[PDB]
Design an enzyme around this catalytic site. Structure first.
Site, short mmCIF file in Angstrom:
data_model
loop_
_atom_site.label_atom_id
_atom_site.label_comp_id
_atom_site.label_asym_id
_atom_site.label_seq_id
_atom_site.Cartn_x
_atom_site.Cartn_y
_atom_site.Cartn_z
CD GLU A 1 0.11 38.92 16.07
OE1 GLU A 1 -0.28 39.42 16.61
OE2 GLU A 1 0.74 38.70 14.64
CG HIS B 1 -6.24 40.72 18.94
ND1 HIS B 1 -5.82 40.80 17.82
CD2 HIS B 1 -5.81 38.76 18.45
CE1 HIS B 1 -5.04 39.77 17.17
NE2 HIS B 1 -5.07 38.46 17.15
#
Ligand SMILES: [Cl-]
Ligand SMILES: [Cl-]
Ligand SMILES: [Cl-]
Ligand SMILES: [Cl-]
Ligand SMILES: [Cl-]
Ligand SMILES: [Cl-]
Ligand SMILES: [Mg+2]
Lengths: 244, 244, 244, 244
Positions: free
Chosen positions: B162, B92
């Protein structure tokens, strides 16, 4: 200073193993004059806390430095309390080494955990290199100075010292080495915090204590109990709780 | 490719908030053609899994790279499965940035998670700096090469990208720049893994997706779903799951 | 854009006056096509919410930038939600002028209130000095740029513009000056955020609006509603809600 | 001088945390010779006052300087009284530093709170830059002279002194430093207001007080009680109330 034993399960349990350990600790005759805690993986905190004797604390093994936020993979003191648990281990030697957690990071965690009402097992450690180069006192002073700058309520803190050169190396610390390290830590508190804090703060030895050596080690000067790894998974933990 | 939505709770929930989110998701009319997963703090995995409809997956937000051992503060895929959860988010952007997790570490985690039979949401990210220095391709290709070396069963992997420069810089990513980043990842898979893998692997956009922009983004050519943070805590998560 | 009216009670009410206002709003025939909210002092949030029609929202008039901490005198979005309230006014001209709140401060509040899932009435304003120096565009652009850097979910944001030179001065803004300012703001959103956000974001005029001019101003092309001060304390608020 | 303890919850509570604190304080055996107050966030004033024993006062943590007006985000002493609460904390070191409230502003608040019939906990503080340079007397006398100018009814005032240099640098003020500072404040009252005011006004120490040191610190010369933050959220608040 009440004798204090924390058994750290590290990453060595699943639900089934926890059930066995919890049943063992729930059934055994335990010294009522020992404050006992277990160190539990984050994913089992609620499970352990619901089943374990309420007189035995449950500590998370780490937490982050704020209550909430976009920090995937982290948990907060507020979440630990939400699972019913009062304790957290901060600055564990495995976080300081494997995960390179700096003293200032640990201090930010300790400060927030204190504001959240947690009880903290704060860890100190020296490496093989530290001990061979004669830096034992230097490293302990630095780690304590950092922690004390974050602590406002010493009554909810317990300190543990681990000699990393005595962990799975073939060498144990001598009784003199253990006593000298804990006496150094207590004298630090006495000179840099207060006599009251020196006299009331539990200092633990984190090392390879088990049924065969715990009664001897429990009688060491300046020692108030133990932070135990592998013995936490075994009947030894009962004998350690009962070492006095 | 089956539309895929993961709502990541990050460190923004307690048990009471989870109870509200879970009730909402349990009661919602969700598109049966969407695979839905929630990203849950380690200390609440079992709670979420026990209260959430079985058809919605539960993902841990991180894990370590071996099954067990002396790793205070870490949990393993094996322990996540022991909590009844099949999924784990790895790499992440918050772990890559705030916790400085290198690609080689994420690779070790992905490999062992593959060994343990997990399903993995493996994340890619481009920082603001990367965008300004024009090294988007360089950084994304390095991240992908690292992930692909650790993956031998792509059927159990979803990729999420992202654009860190598209959140709280004043610059907003157009649908075109989202589609183009995802098409870049997909063609990297065509060139470096296989066209079968490229055709079948779900590619997610991780960004500010909410009830207001989700239906339009869900129709982008190479988008297969979303990794969402804040909206995961709102009724929007149902609209995102239903975006087609 | 659904017509939106917020009546800000500022610091002009006690419990008795709130009871009177709430009774009047609860019984009045309100246009169901209007989204109505009241701006309530922090100490009365729970009281207003528990007595007000569920159809009408309650907004705090300010909040701080974190969820909790050592900030005497401040409240967080999490505490506002805990009072049952969904809205907060941020960057109100009174806080920008009397309390000298800088743009960057307001931006941190907006971002955290967004993370917390609040709906936000974000305010812009030009002072008498700004208008006299011909800096109307400059100040609005600067305030917008700051807010845009903090907003990820525009679906939960309403913008309000106040010309402070029209406040207790003996001069009112003309309908033409209001439309020009709101059209400026909407085109800024078109240029710097996205056409979709400009199309769907409610823009309010904050100024002296009452029963006698609300229908005329409600017909302005780029006006979507009103941020009302003194008329919120009077039967006029019913006519303003019903202005379309 | 009646022993006085105020526990300031700052921005650290929600309704749930208050209900637990309030039940604990309600059920405890509190020394009837102690005047106890809690410092409560504005949005919870009524809730706290309605659930707290009448023997325990409730203080707002701040207020503005007039009774009513166009001051979004502010509340007045009149509104605090309307919530049933008798006390307000004014000049808190967090307001003086984080919010840059000047002495003249704090004096306007104190004078109006006096007019409104409030009881006031008025705070003094010495920052890090103040203990160094050695301006202990000079900045404190500025703060004190400003408070005294705004007070005509000392029977409704308690003074609290915080050594902010202590908490902000992570150390504790000595017992001699605490007694010196409170003797300094009382001697200023003796010479600049009246002997009767110096002799009857409660002077508190605002600092890290907990169950471990509260009995020691409660016996210090010129000390009439405590303003505590973190300990107010813990069972320690009972021990502090009972420290005499
Ligand atoms: Cl516990
Ligand atoms: Cl250990
Ligand atoms: Cl699952
Ligand atoms: Cl996310
Ligand atoms: Cl509401
Ligand atoms: Cl344009
Ligand atoms: Mg090719």
């Amino acid at each position: 200073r009440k004798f204090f034993v924390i058994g750290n399960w590290k990453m060595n349990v699943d639900k089934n193993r926890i059930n066995g350990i919890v049943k063992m600790m729930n059934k055994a005759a335990l010294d009522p004059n020992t404050e006992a805690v277990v160190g539990c993986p984050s994913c089992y905190l609620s499970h352990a806390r619901e089943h374990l004797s309420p007189s035995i604390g449950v500590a998370a093994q780490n937490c982050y430095k704020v209550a909430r936020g976009n920090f995937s993979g982290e948990i907060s003191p507020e979440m630990i309390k939400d699972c019913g648990c009062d304790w957290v281990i901060l600055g564990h030697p495995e976080r300081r080494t494997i995960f390179s957690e700096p003293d200032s990071f640990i201090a930010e965690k300790v400060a927030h955990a204190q504001e959240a009402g947690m009880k903290i097992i704060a860890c100190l450690c020296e490496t093989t290199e530290d001990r061979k180069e004669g830096r034992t006192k230097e490293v302990l002073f630095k780690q304590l100075k950092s922690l004390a700058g974050a602590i406002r309520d010493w009554s909810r803190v317990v300190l543990a010292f681990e000699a990393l050169w005595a962990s799975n190396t073939g060498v144990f610390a001598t009784n003199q080495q253990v006593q000298e390290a804990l006496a150094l830590v207590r004298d630090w508190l006495r000179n840099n915090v207060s006599e009251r804090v020196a006299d009331t703060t539990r200092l633990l030895y984190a090392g390879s204590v088990n049924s065969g050596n715990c009664r001897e080690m429990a009688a060491l000067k300046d020692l108030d109990g133990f932070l135990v790894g592998s013995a936490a998974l075994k009947p030894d933990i009962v004998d350690i709780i009962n070492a006095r």
